[PDB]
Amino acid sequence: SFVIRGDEVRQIAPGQTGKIADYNYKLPDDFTGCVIAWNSNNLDSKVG
């Protein structure tokens, strides 16, 4: 579980290319699973 920008969601895929895909969370070309995403924006609201 982690948080990314909404546009970024395309990255979380097997053997995918992208910054997060290369630098932070990479799924294997073999992978089996499902990915779910939603805007925690209300939650992610701080003054800062």
Partner: protein
């Protein structure tokens, strides 16, 4: 047709798709070749 040209160019997922096609083609071609060799081998063997 140049395998490296695929590998150099494409993201891994697409590369595998293109490569799989190329392999399928070459494999089919190699199998056709081997089949040709085998059938010819029969003709040659009959001759032998």
């Amino acid at each position: 047709s140049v395998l490296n040209d695929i590998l150099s160019r494409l993201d891994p997922p697409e590369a595998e798709v293109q490569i799989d096609r190329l392999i399928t083609g070459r494999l089919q071609s190699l199998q056709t070749y081997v089949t040709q060799q085998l059938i010819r081998a029969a003709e040659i063997r009959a001759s032998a």
